[PDB]
Amino acid sequence: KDKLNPPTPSIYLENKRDAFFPPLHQFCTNPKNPVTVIRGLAGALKLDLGLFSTKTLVEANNEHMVEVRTQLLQPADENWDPTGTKKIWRCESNRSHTTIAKYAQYQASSFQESLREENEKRRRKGPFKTIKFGTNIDLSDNKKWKLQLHELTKLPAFARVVSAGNLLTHVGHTILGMNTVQLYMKVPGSRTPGHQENNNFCSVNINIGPGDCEWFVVPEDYWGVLNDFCEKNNLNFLMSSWWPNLEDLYEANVPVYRFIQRPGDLVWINAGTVHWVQAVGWCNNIAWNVGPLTACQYKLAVERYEWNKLKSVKSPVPMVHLSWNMARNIKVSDPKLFEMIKYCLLKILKQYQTLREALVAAGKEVIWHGRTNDEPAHYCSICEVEVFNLLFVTNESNTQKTYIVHCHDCARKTSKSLENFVVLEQYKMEDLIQVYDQFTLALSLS
Numbered sequence: 001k002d003k004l005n006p007p008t009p010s011i012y013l014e015n016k017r018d019a020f021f022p023p024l025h026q027f028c029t030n031p032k033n034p035v036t037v038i039r040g041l042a043g044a045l046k047l048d049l050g051l052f053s054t055k056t057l058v059e060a061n062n063e064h065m066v067e068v069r070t071q072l073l074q075p076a077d078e079n080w081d082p083t084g085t086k087k088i089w090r091c092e093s094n095r096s097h098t099t100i101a102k103y104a105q106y107q108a109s110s111f112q113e114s115l116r117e118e119n120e121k122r123r124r125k126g127p128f129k130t131i132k133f134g135t136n137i138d139l140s141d142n143k144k145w146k147l148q149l150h151e152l153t154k155l156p157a158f159a160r161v162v163s164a165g166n167l168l169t170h171v172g173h174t175i176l177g178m179n180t181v182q183l184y185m186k187v188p189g190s191r192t193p194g195h196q197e198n199n200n201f202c203s204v205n206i207n208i209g210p211g212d213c214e215w216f217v218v219p220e221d222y223w224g225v226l227n228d229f230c231e232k233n234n235l236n237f238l239m240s241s242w243w244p245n246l247e248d249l250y251e252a253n254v255p256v257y258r259f260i261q262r263p264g265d266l267v268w269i270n271a272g273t274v275h276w277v278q279a280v281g282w283c284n285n286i287a288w289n290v291g292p293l294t295a296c297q298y299k300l301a302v303e304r305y306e307w308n309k310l311k312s313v314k315s316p317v318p319m320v321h322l323s324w325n326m327a328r329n330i331k332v333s334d335p336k337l338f339e340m341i342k343y344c345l346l347k348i349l350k351q352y353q354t355l356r357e358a359l360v361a362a363g364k365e366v367i368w369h370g371r372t373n374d375e376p377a378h379y380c381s382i383c384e385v386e387v388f389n390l391l392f393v394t395n396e397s398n399t400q401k402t403y404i405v406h407c408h409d410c411a412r413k414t415s416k417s418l419e420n421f422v423v424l425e426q427y428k429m430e431d432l433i434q435v436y437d438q439f440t441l442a443l444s445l446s
């Protein structure tokens with residue numbers, strides 16, 4: 001089917017007017033568009049991409065940490081077992097650390113060697129060469145990266161790291177790599193393997209250049225098919241490194257979007273869109289997440305939040321904490337989105353009331369503990385689930401005032417009658433009830 005190789009949703013900007021035009025915002029967040037390629041974005045805004053060149057990065061912070069992935073240099077769009085016999089889903093991707101200065105030396109010498117090879121003139125496949133990919137470089141420190149982060153404020157508001165319409169701005173604290181910028185340094189063949197974004201939040205990626213990247217994209221509502229493929233091939237969809245066999249996908253009638261990202265092109269990945277990427281030339285990229293205020297985004301975030309619990313994987317976004325912040329601080333005028341949030345809050349409230357009464361009925365004391373504001377959400381020190389309001393802390397951690405948090409289930413498993421724990425409460429019930437009761441649908445004529 002030609003429908004199995006659909007065209008790329010793609011917008012071509014010439015100037016600042018095009019970039020700030022509101023129908024662009026609406027196109028990107030439309031659930032029918034799994035990905036949007038915004039071509040010419042840097043040129044239209046006169047963004048200085050030179051602030052992210054390797055030369056500039058070395059000067060700025062030469063000892064900065066870089067995560068290295070050591071990989072095989074594979075042909076075109078394929079992934080072969082090391083022997084070169086058959087195409088398989090499993091990637092080879094070994095981890096180590098280096099610095100910006102050291103990776104930079106390698107990136108440059110890699111290009112010089114390729115020039116010389118090009119001038120040396122002239123098991124079904126392979127054997128394959130080894131390459132290194134510098135990934136997940138942390139650009140959160142505004143003191144170390146002042147000029148770099150300022151340049152990204154030139155973007156239209158919907159695409160910024162920080163904005164009033166961004167759910168990740170309303171979380172109220174830092175989530176590393178999501179509401180902070182990540183940087184990637186590349187040589188040809190550098191691969192970011194198959195994945196969905198953390199808790200299915202949208203993402204922004206800009207190619208710094210000078211070389212191109214090639215992207216592969218599958219819509220959110222086929223993610224289940226790719227999950228089945230991973231399990232059949234003995235891989236964890238959420239945690240393993242895998243690179244889809246395009247012939248397998250075609251056979252299973254899964255459509256695949258495929259396109260080239262040139263320097264200055266911005267790629268918008270919509271919520272839950274499955275994707276994997278490879279460098280075609282020598283380049284750097286920057287990326288972060290954004291959470292549009294839509295029913296579709298909130299729904300997919302909640303779904304992945306609950307799926308992660310079943311798979312014993314931590315959620316970087318604390319969706320209970322976020323939901324309360326939305327009710328406290330945000331006027332919601334879409335009836336669909338409003339009903340979703342109200343439903344979730346009522347479920348949180350009922351569970352909390354049920355647990356609290358059980359504790360009281362058993363004669364366990366609930367200790368008023370309160371809360372520092374802008375204090376981050378808490379997670380269980382053993383199982384890493386989000387823990388809200390009622391915190392379970394050992395007698396000794398309480399005494400030492402280290403307040404090491406446990407969920408109810410993990411505390412019970414340790415201490416059958418909770419005799420080794422105290423129960424801390426960060427919010428009064430009457431106050432949460434008020435927030436819930438006062439959270440009402442706002443009128444908007446839009």
Ligand SMILES: [Mn+2]
Binds near residue numbers: 195196197203269
């Ligand atoms: Mn991604």
Ligand SMILES: [Zn+2]
Binds near residue numbers: 380382384411
């Ligand atoms: Zn736990």
